[PDB]
Amino acid sequence: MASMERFLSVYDEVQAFLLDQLQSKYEIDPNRARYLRIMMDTTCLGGKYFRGMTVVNVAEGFLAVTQHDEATKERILHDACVGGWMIEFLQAHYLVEDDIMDGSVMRRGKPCWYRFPGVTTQCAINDGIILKSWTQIMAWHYFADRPFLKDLLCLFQKVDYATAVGQMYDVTSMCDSNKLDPEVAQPMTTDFAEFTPAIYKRIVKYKTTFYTYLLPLVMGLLVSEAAASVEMNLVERVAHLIGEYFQVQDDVMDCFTPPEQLGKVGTDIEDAKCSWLAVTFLGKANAAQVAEFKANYGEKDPAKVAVVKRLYSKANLQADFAAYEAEVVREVESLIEQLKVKSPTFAESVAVVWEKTHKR
């Protein structure tokens, strides 16, 4: 059975289980079951499923080199699909809540969930909470008797926590750290001293690399009972490296990819985000360029946004991206080589992950 079709079949199965359990154990009525079904479909479906399918692909790699009964192969692949959906539902939680937090308008060419006429923020915040709860409900049901249950739940909650910490790093990245204070309304930085590579790297590491790359890779190992087959420190290093590249590409697209292609209007400049573009620009700018950036960044005024995009264009940041890209290619190939010492199979799965990311 083709992997994507298996993955989609398991979505339907998990959805039916969750809604049936709501009827049999939580007294739900058919109309609220329908609302939650539509909520699940709208918030969890329609992406590329890169994260969930990484779990499946990692598990497929180990099946090709490991002796198993056919029923065991089917169990492992089903487990990989359920685990992949746990990650997709975790992402769905964060996208629902982040879109509310950020006042976002569209996602993937459609309105953000909270903007649906019959949803509203009052419902959508709680819908996002339900999405997160569903990750645990499906784990306890499908993995109840599994040897990896404890490790998988512990990993999942650490990654969830890392992601929330990273969200804090992101939403505070345009303020001066020493002025953070719940009692005092937060001004945007004026010196941009905290727009540095190391501070940028911390935001990205926590807000997206743990749930986008580390969690799918390690979940694939766990459902395969293969974690002792790899050097975990290398798994972490390569997950954080590929994940940073993924976010850098996202940052570039926010500014330069046409909205029809991007699926939304990017507002990182108006929002004063600590983006790869801003950090790289400030790392190469002269005094006059820095002053012009300061006079225009973080402002809704379209003329000021246009000034910032021209500064980026004139600074030839596409060439800095090519140099960054070349160094990532070099470092990821090195880590893949090291992963071969203990597992050529897992190294190949990571090579596939990188190629997909690189060619996005």
Ligand X SMILES: O=[N+]([O-])c1ccc(O)c(O)c1
Binding site for Zn ion (CB under 5 A): 98, 102, 250, 254
- List the one residue out of 244, 246, 258, 360 whose CA is nearest residue 309: 258
Binding span for ligand X by CB under 6 A among 50-58, 105-113, 133-141, 187-195: 50-58
Q: Segment 124-143, which members bind its own copies (CB under 8 A)?
A: 125-127, 129-130, 132-134, 136-137, 140
Indicate the Cα dihedral angle 68, 69, 72, 76, nearest 10°. Answer: 40
Chain centroid to Cα 40, Å, comes to 18
CA 263 to chain centre: 16
Q: What's phi and psi for 45, nearest 5 deg?
A: -105, 155
- Which one among 159, 282, 308, 353 touches ligand X, defined by CB under 6 A? 353
Work out the burial of residue 338: count CB atoms within 10 Å of its CB; fewer than 13 is exposed, 13-18 middle, 19 or more buried.
middle
Q: Give the three-class secondary structure for 107.
A: strand
Residues contributing to the annotated binding site for Mg(2+):
98, 102, 170, 250, 254
Taking CB under 6 A as the criterion, which residues in 246-285 touch ligand X?
246
Beta-carbon count within 10 A of 270 CB: 17
Asked if 265 is part of the footprint of its own copies (rule: CB under 8 A), the reply reads: no
Q: How far is the CB of 167 from Zn ion (least distance, A)?
A: 7
Residue 145 CB neighbour total at 10 angstroms? 6
Is residue 29 within the footprint of its own copies (CB under 8 A)? yes
- 300 part of the interface to ligand X, by CB under 6 A: no
Name the binder of 192 from its own copies, Zn ion, ligand X, none, CB < 5-8 A by kind.
none
User: Does 54 help bind ligand X (rule: CB under 6 A)?
Assistant: yes
Q: φ and ψ at 188, to 5 degrees?
A: -60, 145
Say whether residue 356 binds ligand X (CB under 6 A). yes
Residue 359's H or E segment, with its range, is none
Query: Taking the complex as a whole, how short is the minimal distance between the CB of residue 149 and its own copies, in angstroms?
Result: 8
- The site that binds ligand X (CB under 6 A) totals a number of residues, namely 11
CA–CA separation, 68 vs 77, rounded Å? 12
- What kind and span of H or E run contains 230? none
Least distance between Zn ion and beta carbon 251 (Å):
6
Residue type, 110: K
Q: Does the protein bind its own copies through residue 214 (CB under 8 A)?
A: no
| HEC letters along 306-339 | HHHHHHHHHCCHHHHHHHHHHHHHHHHHHHHHHH
Query: What residues line the site for ligand X (CB under 6 A)?
Result: 50-51, 54, 212-213, 216, 246, 353, 356-357, 360
Query: What residues line the site for its own copies (CB under 8 A)?
Result: 22, 26-29, 31-32, 34-36, 38-39, 42, 97, 100-102, 116-123, 125-127, 129-130, 132-134, 136-137, 140, 150, 153-154, 157-158, 160-162, 164-165, 167-169, 171-172, 177-178, 180-186, 202, 205-206
